[PDB]
Amino acid sequence: KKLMAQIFFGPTYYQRLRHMVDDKIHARARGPMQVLTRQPVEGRSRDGG
Amino acid sequence: NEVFSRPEWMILTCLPVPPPPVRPSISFRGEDDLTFKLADILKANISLETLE
């Protein structure tokens, strides 16, 4: 079906920023804990919480 | 409060030594700065006692 309202269309320049979900997704379930406080460590790369 | 406090008790005549958990040894043992400060205090006290 033809769209009721016409659509603005055309080429445009875009850039993919370094921020990606693959490196921005974290999840913890009883991981390592800091010896000083016996609490979860900081940082997803170090399996933090 | 006399039961739980006294003016004399403010003047500390004995410094409690925190146990190992309060001063964890970081692996690199790697004693923390607080342990070094306690060691320095103990050395100063020993030197003072020897001088006396």
Is there a contact between A31 and A48 (Cβ–Cβ < 8 Å)?
yes
Q: How many CB pairs under 8 A join A and B?
A: 3
Distance from CA of A33 to the nearest CA of B (A): 13
Give one word for B41, left, alpha or beta, with left for phi > 0 and alpha for psi -120 to 50. alpha
Distance from CA of B30 to the nearest CA of A (A): 13
Method: cryo-EM
Q: Which residues contact B15 (CB under 8 A, 6 or more apart)?
A: B41
In units of Å, what resolution does this entry have? 2.8
Instruction: List chain A residues with CB under 8 Å of B26.
Output: 35
Q: Which residues contact B24 (CB under 8 A, 6 or more apart)?
A: A35, A36, B32
Listing DSSP states for B6-38 in one string gives -HHHHS-S------GGGS--B---B--HHHHHH
